[PDB]
Amino acid sequence: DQVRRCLRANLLVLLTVVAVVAGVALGLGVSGAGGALALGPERLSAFVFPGELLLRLLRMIILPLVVCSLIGGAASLDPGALGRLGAWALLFFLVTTLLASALGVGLALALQPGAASSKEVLDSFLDLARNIFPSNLVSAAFRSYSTTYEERNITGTRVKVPVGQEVEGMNILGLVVFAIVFGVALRKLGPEGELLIRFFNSFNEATMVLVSWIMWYAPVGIMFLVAGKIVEMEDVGLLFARLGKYILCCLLGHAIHGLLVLPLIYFLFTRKNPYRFLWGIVTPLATAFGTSSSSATLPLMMKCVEENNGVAKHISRFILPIGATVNMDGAALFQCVAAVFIAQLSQQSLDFVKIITILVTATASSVGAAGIPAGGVLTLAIILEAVNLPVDHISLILAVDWLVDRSRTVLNVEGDALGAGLLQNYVDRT
Amino acid sequence: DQVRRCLRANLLVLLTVVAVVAGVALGLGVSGAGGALALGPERLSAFVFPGELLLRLLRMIILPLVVCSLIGGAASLDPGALGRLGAWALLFFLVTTLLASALGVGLALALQPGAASSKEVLDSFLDLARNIFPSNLVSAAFRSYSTTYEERNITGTRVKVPVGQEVEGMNILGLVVFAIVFGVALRKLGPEGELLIRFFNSFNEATMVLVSWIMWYAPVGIMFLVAGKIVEMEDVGLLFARLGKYILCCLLGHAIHGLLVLPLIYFLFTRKNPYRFLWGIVTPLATAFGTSSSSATLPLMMKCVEENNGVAKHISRFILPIGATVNMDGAALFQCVAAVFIAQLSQQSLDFVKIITILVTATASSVGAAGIPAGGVLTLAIILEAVNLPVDHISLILAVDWLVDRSRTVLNVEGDALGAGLLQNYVDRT
Amino acid sequence: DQVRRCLRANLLVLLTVVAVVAGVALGLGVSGAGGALALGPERLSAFVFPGELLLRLLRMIILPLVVCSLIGGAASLDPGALGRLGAWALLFFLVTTLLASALGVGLALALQPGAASSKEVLDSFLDLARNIFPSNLVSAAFRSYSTTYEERNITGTRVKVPVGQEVEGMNILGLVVFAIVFGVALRKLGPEGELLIRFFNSFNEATMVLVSWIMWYAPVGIMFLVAGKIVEMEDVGLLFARLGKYILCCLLGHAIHGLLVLPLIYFLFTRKNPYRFLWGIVTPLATAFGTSSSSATLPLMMKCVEENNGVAKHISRFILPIGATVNMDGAALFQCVAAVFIAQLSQQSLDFVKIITILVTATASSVGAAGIPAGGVLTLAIILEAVNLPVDHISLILAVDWLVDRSRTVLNVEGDALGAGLLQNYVDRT
């Protein structure tokens, strides 16, 4: 038949959807009883197991991935050899990614989906800053910093005085700064650093096969993961509603971002109608919402932005190819919204500095996740394990990533499309 | 004289035998008193010391050795470029190594030598499986996983519920799987992995000199080690008997393996007389029991297996050279028997999953220990420290490795000799 | 003006002196009140902070620096290809560095500056020796060994019996031996080690830019460091006196070393007047006390030692260039005196084995600190963190390193100058 073509080509996505349709079914069948058929937590602790094995594979693969990939991505950057006219594009990409992430965490905090049913002082900024630059780069790979208070009982009966120590679970946040500074150092070293860069970049592809094989294992892990998850909550008529509120929340966040904020930076700078520009460029968005692929939509988008509202004719070949892989605004929006939704689902007591380190770490990792096909879930697990949040809920987000991803794709092309529709004045207005 | 020739050539073995003949003597002289001449444990804790220093050198050298050597030994394997006719030879080598190790642990458990004078449930398989794929590859280098039980006191007064944490002492077992998957990944990456393979293989010879120098230090360490060991037991008329029972046990295990099990796989597949084949190939076994060297006996063995019972004339040049360094059945037999003998000598309470991880880890490390001349003791220390067993008793095994090694050599050539006498039917019977 | 020339060229030293002149001033202004304006320890724990951030950067940079630099400095050494006539120069350099360090710790212990206002037995040598060769090279990067005593209560009521465990804070001392043996192993491996040496040496320059940038950050860190330090002591009329006693102590140690000990090894071997030799070579010392630079003073010194007291005419081109970067006697003197002064200032209870590991570790690191311009403070922080001493007091030593460094420079040229004035007899007297 023709079934062999559509089987082997798109196999892993069919495997994970046929795994998750049973994972909801098996968890439904054992959730018909109240979490205990014959062994309540005992057989459950082994019934939940291969999803936990999948997370065990994911943590040991997200250590070397982030350190070697950010070394290879911070040695590659050459701001001197990229043009000041191109540098303002990077500035715009960074500020709109920060803006998208900020508004997304703001709206997800405002609606607070999922929540429907350690006293640390303001001086956690010192703990976060000490966690940025760690004590040594081996204890930084498995344990981060944390200050607990004791009582010296001086000047009265009690005094809340902080002692400082290192608690378990790594700091990716404190490691990405060292790897980025290492890549910048390898650039500034120059020709002696060629061997180290050819080492570390080759180390990255020596782990892309590893995450490829973990992706091959991923269906049975995600099936057992979501099965143990829905037998844990014991509320299907509410978890459906929590997931739907989260989905609607992040899609309307995508909508209000792409419909007001990029229009805000348009009209605040160009003072021309953004709606006429978008009405000019409807059809590559009509294929981005068709295919959901930022790679294949790029030639039609580059051809369209030159015809309607004629751009500077070279940045369409310069900033628009490179902007598709660096300004993924909707993906950063999705990751910052979804991680706050898990914390509001598990009641993890968000400090404001936890909001800052879920902002900036997921912001800098927006430029990644492009070589990895399912990098949106991988980077989400990265920023979950950077704040010691439960990665256990990632199956539910990966259960419904398609329905929101169809809308997430168009933000990532709308951003750099409007950036192409913005910097044409900087040779005119200057 | 002629003494300078036989001194410098074979020097280290003369050094360790003249060290161990004094180590039994000094421990005898201080064991004439009951473990306390003038300071019982106090001066003893410094009298025992340089053997513990030798073990301190051995652990810090067996970390990088196993990770870099298994990377260099899992990048080298090419099953696609080795032939399906050659692949069944690898299958046979693996199954006879597993069979030899299984029967050896079975018989050493059955006789239980040395023993003459933490309640963990069946769910340790999850602990072992989580210990296979670790959380991160830096905490995997010094500490493994272990689940302890506490009491939530829910549904009654007490409930044995497992919490999970990471206890000290590394998991080589959890590290060899990552290094092997890394080498396979470097193969599947191809030409970008050339720099990483030339890194990691060069790292191996950057530690073979290290174990050469630790071997140079080894005589005084093993002398003080066995001296502190025999003053610890305070029973020489029994420890002699325990060692003799162990020696007789492993040599008869070698005997029953090479006399029935390889005949079993012969007669079950060929249905021809194995004794006539062995009577044909007596004389290379007569030199293997002469010289005790698998390298030098290989040309005579390859010439002999073609004359008597004429083999397929090319696999003798293909599977018989490579089988001498990969199918070391008797060495794996020795390591799995000797490690169980130490645990039965120290009462280390063997779980069945400890039997599984002393089976399979020592099975996969049978292919090693060939470039290292005294690799039989090194791999034994590896599989002892992979299960947190006391490495302290390794002097007694290295005291008598010669007497059993004379018989251990002939198993390693008898195995692939009978494998050459087996796969000739697969072009005839097919 | 001409101010732009003297600004950009010597900028960092002007930055750190204008930072330290305010750091004494701000700490003076807040020390006018008794350590508490409105928040005693609470705002102080954040007021002290960026100096602690500077130390946080320094520890994570002194791990990879010492391991890669000593690999690159132990692979470079070739005693076979350096001449036995040149090897006695290395022997003399090592013994005069050990002698200078020994006399410096002796005199600094004898005067005991700064002190004006854990019972471990003699068996710490076993703890130090186990700390030399660690258990594994990942736990050796963040935690060292330490034996605590408990009571088995056997043979009486109590018995002080040592248990052994690993306590936090790395052992550089146990790591430098592994890196040095690794570099020697890479030499003895030869042409397969070329890739590893070109890796590790390139890794060194990939951290010299890192310590360059930490040096750029260093002024505000040292200002806040000394400001929090002088508000801690609350005694300026004594800390001035403690610092002056320390300065006078180390400068007179330099004086008595260069005026008696190198004359002692002169007259004990040559039996000629050392004062006539020094009166011959006054003027390169007059420029070394002028410029304070061992690099630029070397041609004038090499020309001067040949004219007055005519040396062997080739070792002046052989041992005198290489001796300027390996025999830094005064720097090792300074580091061993200053570290004992901190321990006598903080009452850190010096064991004799702590004197041994502050002797030998700082002795072997005298050959370093030459490529780093402010390597005298960096190596001081290294040998402070090798013995878990407080690095917190390093601002006061770096506050006054100039006043003693002016005298420290002449020892480093006086040593190898007198060594050139010594080995000329070994072709004459032989």
Swiss-Prot record, chains A, B, C:
GO terms for molecular function: amino acid transmembrane transporter activity; antiporter activity; L-aspartate transmembrane transporter activity; L-glutamine transmembrane transporter activity; L-serine transmembrane transporter activity; ligand-gated channel activity; metal ion binding; neutral L-amino acid transmembrane transporter activity. It is a multi-pass membrane protein. Keywords: Acetylation, Amino-acid transport, Antiport, Cell membrane, Glycoprotein, Host cell receptor for virus entry, Host-virus interaction, Membrane, Metal-binding, Phosphoprotein, Receptor, Sodium, Symport, Transmembrane, Transmembrane helix, Transport. Residues 75-88, 190-198, 270-274, 306-314 are cytoplasmic. Residues 40-52, 112-165, 227-247, 342-354, 389-401 are extracellular. Residues 275-305, 355-388 dip into the membrane without crossing it. One of its GO terms (biological process) is neutral amino acid transport. Glycans are attached at N153. Placenta, lung, skeletal muscle, kidney, pancreas, and intestine. Expressed in CD34-positive hematopoietic progenitors (at protein level). Regulated by L-cysteine, which can either inhibit substrate influx or trigger substrate efflux without being transported itself. It is found in: Cell membrane; Melanosome. Belongs to the dicarboxylate/amino acid:cation symporter (DAACS) (TC 2.A.23) family. SLC1A5 subfamily. Sodium-coupled antiporter of neutral amino acids. In a tri-substrate transport cycle, exchanges neutral amino acids between the extracellular and intracellular compartments, coupled to the inward cotransport of at least one sodium ion. The preferred substrate is the essential amino acid L-glutamine, a precursor for biosynthesis of proteins, nucleotides and amine sugars as well as an alternative fuel for mitochondrial oxidative phosphorylation. Exchanges L-glutamine with other neutral amino acids such as L-serine, L-threonine and L-asparagine in a bidirectional way. Homotrimer. Interacts with ERVH48-1/suppressyn; may negatively regulate syncytialization. This is Neutral amino acid transporter B(0). It comes from Homo sapiens.
